[PDB]
Chain length 268, copies 6
């Protein structure tokens, strides 16, 4: 049963789903806790984004979240704080197989992200650290030969520059998906982070269509359910539909307001 | 400003609200994290219960959640894992002023809980450690003289025996409130933690009435608005209306379901 | 897949193996780390003992080691620091289903350990916290109804007194297994923790025979292959065959020595 | 009362004091603990420096120190380990509003530090992560519109090069203060980290005067009380007058020596 | 060098100094941090008290502070949160050799504290875990045979009752020292923790004299040089002369005040 | 005795041994725990490598491992995640004296690593942070004057490029040792991380010889005992002969298999 566990441990199920065109519904994890990560792994999402960029996580807290999520069907995706080969290698070492790389502005940057995930001759990943959690400390059979094909690289586009360069980014082998950051894009476009303007929505919708038609997976984070459904209709394949901190804050506020109202009606 | 900060830090605002008969709406905290504690401290609850009994908290995690909540209006209440004077001493040292003590079965046990929170001659609290976070390392003026009156002891009744002893429990000086846990009571009564039976509900309602009419604050953990209003109309004063882990799981699941994940 | 995950999470596979009479080979975990726990969970042991008694673990570190081990076939067993119902409640809340309870001296103490793991009417476990990791925050269907039967209580006998009381201990319903710690027994018997004396070995062997013949599982911690086979031939069912700290120190020292460091 | 809390949470009180010319007396925090941070927040300092450069802190320990200090009147300032926009954004995300940026050598570097703290069009800060502790998870009203003006950027000058470039650094909009590192400056000047030589003191004093006369706030760390008072007389506005580790070590040593002397007098 | 390291690690240098009648100057550690513990280990104190009773420490933080202090000449003493054999066992396992046991009221309790630190037949310490940090994972040669004699048990007297029982406490074999906490005693005596009353001071001085004249070491926590010299002249042998949290707060405040912050 | 402790604390014993030509046998630490570090410090190795590159460590966990190891005879060496002066300075601050710097490709990079460890005029280390654990919070007498000479810089060569540049790397003053990464070298040479090919072994053996004959210390990590002995015979001076995670995994698997076999023989 150890044998079968390790055989099964290599396959990147999120990647397989993207390649099959199966839309994957996700939740962003900013609570930076292995405890809430496990709780949320039971909620039914296809994927969970462990945010190493804008939540107080580091390689060690990423590791404990991966350990928490492991037995659940929900698949982990990890965002490093930047497109940094050193950060990427440390994340791969602890077992990350799907990366959401921020601030990818052009094809050279996209290529650098891909190369950081692949062993020679395909990239610059060091074979010497294969013995970490990535290969389960040398228990996954034929790990070195199998690893490159199971890496899934998703690049974020969040500026006018990146949109301009989207066709060349799409041409990069090993870019499996392209994620759009709508608030950052809006801000770069002069709309102050409010994506609900025609010019911003036009840019977003056109990019989703272009990514999908290039044979790659479009992604986006959108807390507005109606917009999320629109992006799915346009062929988006990895759509994060909320953020754990927001879900918690908004549910808690709604609860305090409703019951607070009851206390006030009894004791004016 | 420091002097004014410290002069203000001593007052137990939760206790003052209970004594004024102002109902207090609370949320249970089982996420055992200073980060979600701060986030939830901004949501608008009157009180937050840092659960040391059934969440993976210890004195250290209670400390950081107290630090996180401190600047917010929401008031922290801590549940130790048992009515243990040592555990109570440690929670007080880190700055806990309102305790929710589990499994208080009789007046002797209620008295023991109270005595654990009070300096001599009123109790057995060791003055040794006035110098911990409780006195802000000896910055709160007249701390020793002021501390006993700002302690707020709430006792849990969870069994048929505790219910039988309620009148005697209510007579214990220093018991400020009595909390009923409907699930545990239902379980002890034979209804497998399902509180939605007339016999359980009858026992709960009568207890709330007795507690309030004795001049003490009734508390309860509930999830239904209409039942909450009913317990409020019957005099309940510290009503916890959800649990952080549950709120998060249910919101998350509802969201995933809306997309057919 | 979530529904199927949760339906499967309830079953105590270790308990099922003991009841089927399948010997289970274990490793003691004293490294008190979720990282080495995961590494060791892949090594091929049937069970891993997360030691809360003689390693620097607490409920929080037990939790993270349970999360680390979860996806592997190796089954976790947790040793609390004492036969304490509060500590037992907390370990159960974080998801412990198999307990190794130290210093059980008599049937009363064995019964107390069992009762601590069971909901009413079978025990004193508080239903209050079905909602912790134990029920996966209320996702495991019919958790309350199913939990008691999946709890596995193993009691340690460490003294001459415990040995004298063994027949009565074996009669306690809900005692699934009895573990003998050869070092502590040897110490109590006057042999300074050296178990390699006929009198100690005679006492150990007879206990294993009595336990198995009563229909319960014998357990022991040993390091020698031939002695392990002997205890297995005598009916032992949960045999721990090393300790992580020892394995690591001895491997490290042997390596350094081979280079004349 | 939540409402009023969040309204009050936005204002950078340290910045306001600097702009008003009110000298601010500070303590350096290198103990890297939220517990001693809270203790020291009660001591009466105007500001506390959470040192992310030369103490064993990271974004997560910075967060817990900010949470500890929050209810006290003492204001937190955070030093990142370098002038790195990625580190700066993570610090801003967890709620940092005043940054002390090390090793700023020229105006381009000073400009880069400022831009890392401001949303478009003023800088390169991403609006997408406003939902972290910075906006108290979207509770601070009009956070995006208010954030830029409450950021306070202090740049360190600690080399001959930086002194040479001081006039241009002073010309950078959004540089609110310039901190002098006297030991590093001394070392760069050939005086081996001992600042008590005329040439080093001349450089330091002249820079304080120049910074203040440019309309900006001078800062410095100085454990020598007499020098601290001199720098204040010259118009310095954020003066750190000790370091927690040093205060603890020196107080402890003095205590052991005095009582040790007593034990020795009784038992020669 | 390893063999020589381990041969040297067993010796309790603090105990040896007390037995030689060499006064030992100490600092209380409440900062609950391995980093400040190391810093303070270099300051020149003979001993450092890692407070498990009134600081937010647990067995894990005690462990890291022991590791931090280890290479320095200053010797660690640990205060458990209570006279609890389980807590004592856990502290010993991580390598504690000198215990300061709070709230020892009578000889029975003193004997219980001693017995908790000793292997059979001298006590009830479980040999099971010689293999933890205490034996350096079985590297200290002849650990089991040597451990009992290197344990140093110091008991706290905090009440009028404990004072009455002092003669009997002093007669307990294995009580190496008796510590008086002036604040708690003052509190029990009716003086609200203010030890600067003749009646309290009279009781303290007489106790120090009785302890030393019985052949045991007196200890106390004080802050005044002249009072320290007086207690030293009266025979005190382990004198704590400040508290880390207090030293830091007072130094910090004095500094801020000098600049009119 | 404090005095004598601090006098003794400055000397880098690992460096002294390398300079004396005494071979030093090491173990790699990837378990990222101060508890197992202390355990392993008692095992008899000359040195222990605290891996900040490919294990889930950070400056703070490095600090706790240094504190754990301190009283033992085994000497700590720390690998930062990259040749980064900011990371290097933080490691030096917490008391690191021997650094194993990854991915050093040429002499300029080797020089940069050395300079990051030395105070002016020899390098760019800041004197201002000498007051951290490095000087034991200002207790080590004459720390500033003594520090440079006790720093020990070991550079990793792990590519064909680095091998090409080895003669120039050897010429860099302050490079005390050169470590060869055999699996990474093999991968860069087209042999897929398996070092057991003649061309890879020829490269490795020749480099060891060249490093030693230049008057510098050769190093390598090799879990194969027979190869380790060959490299020692060729004059290697710091040879890591295993990895803690591997030793633990392999010992545990052997144990489970042997006793599992016994259970199976009793209960077929």
């Amino acid at each position: 049963t150890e044998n079968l566990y390790f055989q099964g441990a290599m396959e990147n199920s999120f990647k397989a789903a993207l390649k099959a065109g199966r839309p994957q519904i996700g939740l962003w994890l900013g609570l930076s806790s292995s405890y809430s990560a496990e709780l949320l792994a039971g909620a039914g999402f296809d994927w969970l984004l462990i945010d190493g960029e804008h939540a107080p996580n580091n390689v060690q807290t990423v590791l404990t979240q991966l350990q928490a999520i492991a037995p659940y069907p929900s698949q982990p995706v990890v965002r490093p704080s930047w497109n940094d080969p050193v950060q990427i290698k440390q994340l791969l070492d602890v077992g990350t197989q799907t990366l959401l790389v921020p601030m990818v502005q052009n094809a050279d940057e996209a290529r650098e992200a891909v190369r950081a995930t692949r062993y020679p001759p395909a990239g610059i990943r060091g074979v010497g650290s294969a013995l970490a959690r990535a290969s389960r400390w040398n228990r996954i059979p034929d790990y070195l030969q199998k690893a490159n094909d199971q890496m899934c690289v998703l690049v974020q586009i969040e500026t006018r520059e990146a949109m301009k360069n989207l066709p060349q980014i799409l041409d990069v082998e090993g870019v499996d998906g392209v994620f759009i950051g709508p608030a950052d894009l809006s801000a770069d476009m002069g709309y102050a982070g409010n994506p609900q303007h025609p010019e911003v929505q036009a840019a977003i919708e056109q990019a989703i269509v272009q990514i999908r038609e290039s044979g790659k997976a479009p992604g986006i984070l959108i807390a507005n359910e109606q917009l999320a459904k629109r992006y799915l209709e346009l062929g988006a394949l990895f759509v994060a539909v909320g953020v754990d901190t927001t879900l918690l804050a908004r549910a808690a506020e709604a609860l305090a307001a409703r019951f607070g109202a009851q206390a006030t009606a009894v004791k004016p």
